[PDB]
Amino acid sequence: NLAPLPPHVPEHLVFDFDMYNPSNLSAGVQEAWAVLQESNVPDLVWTRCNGGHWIATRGQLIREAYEDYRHFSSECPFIPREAGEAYDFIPTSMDPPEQRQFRALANQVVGMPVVDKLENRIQELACSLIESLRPQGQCNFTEDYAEPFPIRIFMLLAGLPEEDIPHLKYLTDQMTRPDGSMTFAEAKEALYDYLIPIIEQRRQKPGTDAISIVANGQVNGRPITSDEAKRMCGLLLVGGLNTVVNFLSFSMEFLAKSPEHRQELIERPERIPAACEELLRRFSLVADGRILTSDYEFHGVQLKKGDQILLPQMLSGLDERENACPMHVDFSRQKVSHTTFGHGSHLCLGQHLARREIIVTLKEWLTRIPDFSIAPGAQIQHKSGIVSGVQALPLVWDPATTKAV
Ligand code: HEM
Ligand SMILES: CC1(C)[C@@H]2CC[C@@]1(C)C(=O)C2
Ligand SMILES: [K+]
C-alpha cells in the first residue's frame, strides 16, 4: 500500500521506489536501485512506499546531507519510521558532538589497531575455510564462506560462542532485511535480552574481548552505563554479522562470471587493494538515512520537520556523475569514488576490518581456486533492505585445476 501523499510534496517529485523490494530486483539489486538515477527521475524524489519518505539519488546530495547533521539528524536513521524510532544504537543514533566520546570507544575495539592485532587469525581462518572447500569442487558460498569467515572472526573479537551465531544472525537479518516475522523493536529487544546478562558478567569479571572493553569503558570522564554499553554492542553485532557477510557474496558472484578479472588479480596481486575498492563501489550495499530537524529547502525542495530522508550510501558510486560507466568493473580506475562506508561524522569504524577481510579473501581464494563458476541452472537472487544481500551462491569447479599452498 502506498501512503497518502503529504500536502507539501509536489506530485512531479513522486517516485514510488520500495527500498525493501525494488522492481528490477531480478537484474540485480544495484541495478534495481540504479533506476532512480535514470533521466526521468529528479535528484530528490518522494516515495509513498513504506510510510512515505524522500530519497536523494545523487552522490552530491547524499554527501551534503550526510555532512549537515544540524538539518539531517541521526536520531531516526531507519525507514520505516517505526524502525527509525526504535533504533537506539550508539553512536549511530546520536549527532555530533554527543557521538564523539562513544565513537572513540567503539574505535578502540574495532579500529585499525585491533585489525592489525588479529591479522594472523584472519589469514588463518580464510586459508582454513578455503582449503576445506577446495577438494569438494563445489560449495554454497553464502553459507560455506561468506558467513563463517567474517562472523567467526567477529565472534572471536567479541568473545561470544560460535553456537550463538544462528540465533544472532536471524535477529540481525530482521533489522536489515525484515521477512515480516518481527518488527525492528522486537528484533532489538531479543538482541538486547541476549546482551544484557553477558554485559553484567563482563562488567563484574572483565576480560580482553570487545564486549568487556566496551562495557568497562569510560565516556567523558565517567564510566559507561550498562544501557550505553548495550546499545553500542547491539550495533557491533549488526556490523559484525550483516555487512562483509553480504558484500563477499556480491564480489564472488562477479568473480565467478569474470575469468579475465580473476586472472588479472592472480597475475598482478598488488592490484587486489584497488580491486577491493572497485568492488566496494560497484557492489555497494547499504542504504540508511536521516530525519529533518526543522523545515528546510534543500536544492529547491521544501523539506518538512520530521520528514524522513533516505540517503543511499550505495548510489553515490553508481552515479555516472561520480564515475564514468558506473556499472562496469574496472580495477584500474584512476579514482574509485564512493560512499560505501558512509560519509560525515558516522563514517564506518569497521571499514579497516572490512577491507582486510575482503583483501585476504580475494588473494587466498584466488590462490587455491583460480577457476570457478556459478553452478549451471543456478538462478542467483538478491534481496534489498538497509543492507542488501545474496540469497544463495552455488559455485562449482574442477579440483584438478585448484592447488593447495
Ligand atoms: C562491507 C562492510 C561494511 C559496510 C559497507 C559498512 C557500512 C557502514 C555505513 C554506511 C556506516 C554509516 C551509517 C550512518 O551514517 O548512519 C557505518 C557505520 C559503522 N560501521 Fe560499518 N560497515 C561495514 C562493516 C562494518 C563492520 C565489520 C563493523 C564492525 C563490527 C562495522 C561497524 C560500524 C560502526 C560501529 C559504525 C558507527 C560509527 C559511528 O556511528 O560513528 N561496520 N558502516
Ligand atoms: C547502516 C549499517 C551498515 C551501519 C553498521 C550496521 C548498520 C546496519 C548500521 O546500523 C550502521
Ligand atoms: K531512535
Curated annotation (Swiss-Prot):
Cofactor: heme
UniProt subcellular location: Cytoplasm
Pfam family, one: p450
Signal peptide: none
Pathway membership: Terpene metabolism; (R)-camphor degradation
First-tier enzyme category under EC: oxidoreductase
Keyword Oxidoreductase recorded: yes
CDD domains: P450cam-like (cd11035)
Chain positions recorded as heme binding sites: C348
GO cellular component, as recorded: cytoplasm
Reactions catalysed: 2 reduced [2Fe-2S]-[putidaredoxin] + (1R,4R)-camphor + O2 + 2 H(+) = (1R,4R,5R)-5-hydroxycamphor + 2 oxidized [2Fe-2S]-[putidaredoxin] + H2O
Molecular function as annotated in GO: camphor 5-monooxygenase activity; heme binding; iron ion binding
Listed EC numbers: 1.14.15.1
Keywords associated with the record: Cytoplasm, Heme, Iron, Metal-binding, Monooxygenase, Oxidoreductase
A biological-process GO annotation: (+)-camphor catabolic process
Family the entry assigns: Belongs to the cytochrome P450 family.
Role this protein plays: Involved in a camphor oxidation system.
Name of the molecule in the record: Camphor 5-monooxygenase
Gene source species: Pseudomonas putida
